[model samples]
Target: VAPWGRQWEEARALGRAVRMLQRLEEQCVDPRLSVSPPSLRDLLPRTAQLLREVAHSRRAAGGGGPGGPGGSGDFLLIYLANLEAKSRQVAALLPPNDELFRAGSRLRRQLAKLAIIFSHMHAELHALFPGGKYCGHMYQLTKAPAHTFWRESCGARCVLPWAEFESLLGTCHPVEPGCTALALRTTIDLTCSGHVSIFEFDVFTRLFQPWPTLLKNWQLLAVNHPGYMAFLTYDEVQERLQACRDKPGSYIFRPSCTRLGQWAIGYVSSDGSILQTIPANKPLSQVLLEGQKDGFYLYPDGKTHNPDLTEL
Candidate 1:
């Protein structure tokens, strides 16, 4: 027979061995050969023999052994070889007098069968990437979505790593020690849903250019509110805040009113009298922790609180 014909024969034998071994459990689910015959013990060696035969047949048929036109086929050969090794390792643990001998035997049998089945499937799939276009196609597919979020929300036209973007911004406003660009990006992503545009980023950096003082405030707010902030213009946040207010001490908590949605942090006083209004200029992180004597908790970001949850 020609080399290809010889290879095909070996491959078919290996495939049959794999299928028969898969049905071993149906023949006997019991690990011990109580009612079941010792058929699986015999099948394991036969499957290993077939794997050896198939590997040699493919190599002899001029199907590139490793770096040739049939690299995928060669890859299957390596994979099967590893699986074959595992089968042998499991088989070695099977002892005639061991307490778990039946269990060990069953595991060894299954490993060899799985190896055969995997190699047979891989051989069948060899034709799909015949022209070596598989890698290129996969590369394009995986690379497309890496920066999709940043592009859609922040309008980043070119792909830039988090660190690189940070470095560029650092030229104008240097990042302080103990913080990184990636950390800042993550904070913003949690707070703003990564919807802050280039212009908004610039406006923010310019507004708080000294870096340490104001940058800390932004980070503080981000750490305090661990939810997505829907994109809203600063003016819009103010408008919503006004609409939600009914009277003095009447406010609401909204989830997505600003860059980082607000949370009600202050407590209501025990006497039920409203605490004096929170200073507008106080840093949110500091204000959130102040006056825990049961005062009032309000989301200052411009949305109404749930009536069921609110007291005022």
Candidate 2:
């Protein structure tokens, strides 16, 4: 294989492994098990360093040509460095003999794979967008002051294949000052007991992002109580949903939400994406109650659900 080909091949393998780690991380249902692998954290900085070598190699191969001004090297460095720091913060929460120790150990086994994947992705990204300035326009969207869509929301940005993004560039107009016609999609799945359902729900750009500036508009609200007919104020339900957003796995509610004395099963997704299973017309309270009728829960206690039910 050509040298470039070899690099790419290796990069591809790493990419797959990174994605695998992400899936595995998501599969950990217990909060204790959800810690990012410590080895992976250590490897991220090394991966960034490796990509820096590749970037220099690319420049050499190009005959010492002037590279795009944006320091893709610095971008990768900063990004990976930030992740490493975050991982440490996450790990610090777990100590020896803590309940999370075993789970953290299981997670550690996957660290090398995570590091390899990130290194490969950084190298590939440099290859695709030489200077890392391909998304300059995206940053521009954040600069303008008049765009409400960008100003009032939690920004979630997504990168697109050039062709798809270009197509929208020609056909769309900005409704808000910084508005651009791009979409982001986030998917959340459902699982029960040991049976993993084929069902999934998707969040589109309006709810999440093509722009990284907006807060995710979607929220999954769920509850699990021994009561068959539970009732909660809207504020209480929202607060519970907020708490679940921090953990992995779907949120389940039994003794579900009540709308006019009707009990419904409700849950917020592990990632906090709102459940699409409920009808759009119904109020959230009603949807929670009505969704239960559709058999949303197989177990009354929320604790019974495990990672096997849905591995993200």
Candidate 3:
């Protein structure tokens, strides 16, 4: 076959352009883009500049809603979600650096704030723009007021003051939640009054901005390491070891949260558990390879995600 399908790159780019223009309006609020345009010759540069390359306007909405439940415009909404998740993943998984790594506590909180902005993007989108029209959409660390917690379904992420993060913080960490959670809420609350707005904890997440501060180990896993491919806290590892307690041969090794770059291992040795530190310079993979003779496999098959260069 000659291979024909959806609008391919054209639909994706148009979807991207539409999403960008809608976001521009969310804040700018000066232009009123409420209906089909009279013409495309003159438009906001994001809309004009992007569609400028295309020869036809009717050709734009060729891709139907791949996410289902709607039309081509809805597909762009879903496509926007697709693009936004990618940005978050990239921001989270960039190479570890002195400037970024040293930024320490700044990493999780800043990225966490980003998570909120994303939720509110689609949040307002549903309320204000409606995907067909193109538009936009946080909460806390608690289950008590479940409404306050923003768990984004698209990225499978929970970025708020809620306790899932508390549950996840088993490794040696940057303190616990509640008041600190409140502090985080207030921090994101920044200059805004109702909940948190883009004007709040947003600007700093943009590494694209000029002469920016670097980053820290913000991703769920650090990108590079020998065997303890994970960048987990000590207690974080501990919880995993105790998560089931039956796999005596399983092992988890991780880079230290408090000590910064060094790694340690936790192994379940039949009756009890033991922990050890592997040299930052040596490859823990070699030791793990040798220990496989003892029937040790990496613990929790699908659970512990290091986000190595595999996900495509």
Estimate candidate 3's alpha-carbon lDDT, on a 0 to 1 scale: 0.35
By summed lDDT, the worst window of 10 consecutive residues in model 2 runs over 191-200
Give one digit per residue, the lDDT tens place, for model 2 in 1-312: 222233344334334434443443333334433223223333334444544554445445531222222233323333344344434443444342334333224443333223323333343343334452323223323213313332233122222222332333233322221222212111111110111011111112222222232222222222113312122322233444455554433344422211111223345554555342323333333443444445443323244432221111
Kindly list the per-residue Cα lDDT of model 1 for residues 114-182, writing each as its tens digit: 333333223222222233222211211111232232344323222233455556555544665454555
Best by TM-score: 2
lDDT of 3 by residue, 1-312 (tens): 001234465455555655654443343232321122211112333332333333133254342323332223443334345445634442343332212432235563343333333333333223222323322232222122122222232122212222333333222234335555454343233222223322122221221011111112222122232233332444445555765356565566653332222345677666756454454433334344455544554542214432232221
Q: Positional deviation of 233 in candidate 3, in angstroms?
A: 1.5
| lDDT winner, 2 or 3 | 3
RMSD of each: 20.8, 16.1, 19.7
Q: After superposition, how far is residue 306 of candidate 2 from its true place, in Å?
A: 19
Per-residue lDDT, model 3, residue 15, is: 54
Clashes per prediction?
9, 20, 21
TM-score of each: 0.24, 0.27, 0.25
User: What does the lDDT come to for candidate 1?
Assistant: 0.35
CA lDDT of every candidate: 0.35, 0.31, 0.35
